[PDB]
Each structure stands twice: as structure tokens, then as C-alpha cells.
């Protein structure tokens, strides 16, 4: 971004590359005035874009990084580091651990240097509240003070919500929703925003692509409305949609194609909580809307 | 404008009328920007959230002189009775239309102005039009 901001962005990129291929947990901190200016610029840029973004084909969209610096670095090394490749996370981009801050800083730096080669989203694990995602709020409270935490929360609330790949594949966090009607109210819903417990964005971030329901029902979050196969099919038919991205789940195969290859549940969460050996994967979207399952380590 | 009076309108709570021009000290000068229009009503609080539409239209000083070319009592002295009658036929008719309604009679719609014209007669009409808010 700015001269000091761009220098800090280059330094953070170099630090992440030096921490690439190694154990996760990078932080990538900064100064006080410089970080305040960078956060203000990032909030302004993210709020500048609409809630419904559009991807630039081709791109290497990853699954749920779960706030892992090692996973993000591996995706950058394999799927293409920024700004050499466009990245679009489906959701759950931040989670428990001290490695989500580095990924967020890298994404912000890439967007500042090239907004057409950087994108990320949040799900049930990367929510703005510590009730659903304490891997950010509690981490900031323990490490940093409250002013920087408030600035980060405001910047995150000033971010976009969804993305689309050539109007072919929907880059959603989880599954469909019964509350989502059209894009007119989505683009109208500007900053600020957050993942709720129930509704449409709540079902996108917390719920996953449901098949036991038809129009609406309960979800894994317990309050979300995991729209069933019928609701997703009706939404795709009305909106001429073909694919929807799913994340925020422990995928044993990483990338699962659901709804007859219409819900690519790509998840980049390797070894979720250790016990759940969830596989990592990415959605390699080519220039001709060719969705490929780029699996990764578990 | 954006590089000179940047903070002058961004989160500055500038509730100026739509149509005003204010000189701004920018670029070792005093750049005056005239308020072309406002989506809100005339007095709109120009803040950073307010989207100030701006084009490359430079306002010539001819309009400035014309606005400064107001019409009042500059060549009219002593026509107090006529001026009062006109104002009552206009202002009292407008500012106190309920007074006319309670009076149960409309004022004289047709008023004639005899005399040597252009001695201020044309000036009288100009002053009326400048004072008058109606068509």
C-alpha cells in the first residue's frame, strides 16, 4: 500500500517465504502508527468492494486454511504465491493458534499490492466473535492490547462477504441458505457485517451443504439453517448457478464434490485438532471455469 | 479539491446550503468551490460518508457577479407606501395566507404600477423578482 505500508508488506511476504515450508505460527507484527495506517487503508479497500466479489480466472482457490501459516505457505508455494496467483478462501480462514495473523497479514498485503490476486472468506471457525471463533479475539487479547484488537475487528467487519468465479462457481463458506433471496440485497449489505447464528450469511458461514433437508432445517452450529439439496437446487436454478463452495468442516478427503459436482466441499484443514485427521485440499479454478480438486496434506 | 481541501469535508460536518461557494486555501491560493447540487436538502452535512459528486466544471466569475447583482432598495427612496402595499399583496398574502383566509377576502390579484418607467420602475420589478420566491 503506502510507502511504509508497502515496505511492511514486502517484509511480511519475505518473512512468510522464509517461514514457508516450516512449522506454522508466524505473526508478522508491525509498528504502531504504520499498523494503524495499514489497518485503515485495508478497511477502506475492503469496504470499497461490494459484498459479492468476482474472481479473476484462472485462480488457485484453497479450502479452509483454519488459520495455519504452514498450510497457507504450502498453498502459496504450490498453488501460486501472491500476486503470481489469485487466491480465494472459501471460509474458516482464521482459527485457533498463532498462525492466522500471518495469513491475514499476507492476504491484506497481497490485496494492497494486487486486489485481483488476493481474496479470503470466513466461516464458522473464522467468525468475528469469540463465541464462534476465539482463535482471533482471545489471541489478540492475550498478545496485544484492546485498541489494536478493536481496529482489527473494525477492519474485518469492513470486509466483503462472498465471491464468484466467472458467475459459475459460488465461493461460499458452507452450504446454501433459505434466507438468501437474490444479489440485490447482498450487494446492498455493505460494511459492517458478521457471521450470525441463523439466517442466510449465518447458514453460509456456520452451516454446510445439507442433503437431509429440502428447504431449510437445523445445522451443525445448532442455530444455522443448513439448506438441503432442494433449496440449493432451487437457488441454483433461479440464479443460474452451477457450483457452490463448502468449508468449515473436517473433510477426510479434503475436497468433496457434493450435489453432483455442484458443491465442491474443499477443506484445507490438515489434522483438525490432531484427533480428526482431516485432509487438506484446494479448488484449482482454471480460466474456463474448470474446477479441479487440488488435494493437500492432512 | 481532493488534494487541497481533503479534511475540509471528510468527517468535518459541513452543513452548507446546496449552491454555496467557499474559498479554500489550497496550492498557495484560495480555491472557491461552488456547491453544484446535493442529493439531500440544501443544508446537507458534508461528511466523509457523504459522497461529494465532483466534475471538472469551473464556475466563471460572471455568475459570481450576477449573484452579487442582487436587487433591493438601492435606487428607491421614499416609495414606502408602494413597497408596503406590494409586500402585503405578496408577503402578507404568502407569509400570512391564513390572515387572508380569516379576512374572508382575497387580495388584489391585478395591481397596476403607473409612473415614469425605468426610473426605478424596471428596478422595482427586479427587486420584486429577487425578493419573490414564487414564479
Amino acid at each position: 500500500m503506502a510507502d511504509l505500508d508497502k515496505l511492511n508488506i514486502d517484509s511480511i511476504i519475505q518473512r512468510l517465504l522464509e517461514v514457508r515450508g516450516s512449522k506454522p505460527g508466524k505473526n508478522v507484527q508491525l509498528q504502531e502508527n504504520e499498523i494503524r495506517g495499514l489497518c485503515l487503508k485495508s478497511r477502506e479497500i475492503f469496504l470499497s468492494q461490494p459484498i459479492l466479489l468476482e474472481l479473476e480466472a484462472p485462480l488457485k482457490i484453497c479450502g479452509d486454511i483454519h488459520g495455519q501459516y504452514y498450510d497457507l505457505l504450502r498453498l502459496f508455494e504450490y498453488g501460486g504465491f501472491p500476486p503470481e496467483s489469485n487466491y480465494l478462501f472459501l471460509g474458516d480462514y482464521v482459527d485457533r493458534g498463532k498462525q492466522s495473523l500471518e495469513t491475514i497479514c499476507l492476504l491484506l498485503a497481497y490485496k494492497i499490492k494486487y486486489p485481483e490476486n488476493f481474496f479470503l472468506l470466513r466461516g464458522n471457525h473464522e467468525c468475528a466473535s469469540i463465541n464462534r471463533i476465539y482463535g482471533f479475539y482471545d489471541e489478540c487479547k492475550r498478545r496485544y492490547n484492546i485498541k489494536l484488537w478493536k481496529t482489527f475487528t473494525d477492519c474485518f467487519n469492513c470486509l466483503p462477504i462472498a465471491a464468484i468465479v466467472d458467475e459459475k462457481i459460488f465461493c461460499c463458506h458452507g452450504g446454501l441458505s433459505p434466507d438468501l433471496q437474490s444479489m440485490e440485497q447482498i450487494r446492498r449489505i455493505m460494511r459492517p457485517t458478521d457471521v450470525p447464528d441463523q439466517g442466510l450469511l449465518c447458514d453460509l458461514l456456520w452451516s454446510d451443504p445439507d442433503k437431509d433437508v429440502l428447504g431449510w432445517g437445523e445445522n451443525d452450529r445448532g442455530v444455522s439453517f443448513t439448506f438441503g439439496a432442494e433449496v440449493v437446487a432451487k437457488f441454483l436454478h433461479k440464479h443460474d448457478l452451477d457450483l457452490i463452495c463448502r468449508a468449515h468442516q473436517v473433510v477426510e478427503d479434503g475436497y468433496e464434490f457434493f450435489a453432483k459436482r455442484q458443491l465442491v466441499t474443499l477443506f484445507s484443514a490438515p489434522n483438525y485438532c490432531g484427533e480428526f485427521d482431516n485432509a487438506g485440499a484446494m479448488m484449482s479454478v482454471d480460466e474456463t471455469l474448470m474446477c479441479s480438486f487440488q488435494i493437500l496434506k492432512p | 479539491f481532493e488534494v487541497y481541501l481533503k479534511p475540509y469535508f471528510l468527517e468535518a460536518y459541513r452543513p452548507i446550503r446546496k449552491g454555496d461557494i467557499f474559498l479554500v486555501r489550497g496550492g498557495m491560493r484560495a480555491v472557491e468551490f461552488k456547491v453544484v447540487e446535493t442529493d439531500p436538502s440544501p443544508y446537507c452535512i458534508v461528511a466523509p460518508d457523504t459522497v461529494i459528486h465532483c466534475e471538472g466544471e469551473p464556475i466563471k466569475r460572471e455568475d459570481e457577479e450576477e449573484s452579487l447583482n442582487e436587487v433591493g432598495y438601492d435606487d428607491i427612496g421614499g416609495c414606502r407606501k408602494q413597497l408596503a402595499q406590494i409586500k402585503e399583496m405578496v408577503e402578507l398574502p404568502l407569509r400570512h395566507p391564513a390572515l387572508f383566509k380569516a379576512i374572508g377576502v382575497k387580495p388584489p390579484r391585478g395591481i397596476l404600477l403607473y409612473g415614469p418607467p425605468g426610473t426605478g420602475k424596471t428596478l422595482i420589478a427586479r427587486a420584486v423578482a429577487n425578493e419573490t420566491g414564487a414564479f
Binding site: 470499497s48 | 479534511p7 453544484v36 465532483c54 466534475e55
Partner: peptide
Amino acid sequence: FSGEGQKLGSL
């Protein structure tokens, strides 16, 4: 002269 058509001076 135009309204809400040019990119404005963002702060």
C-alpha cells in the same frame, strides 16, 4: 458537471 458518476475524493 455530473453527480455520483466520478470516483470522488476518498478520505
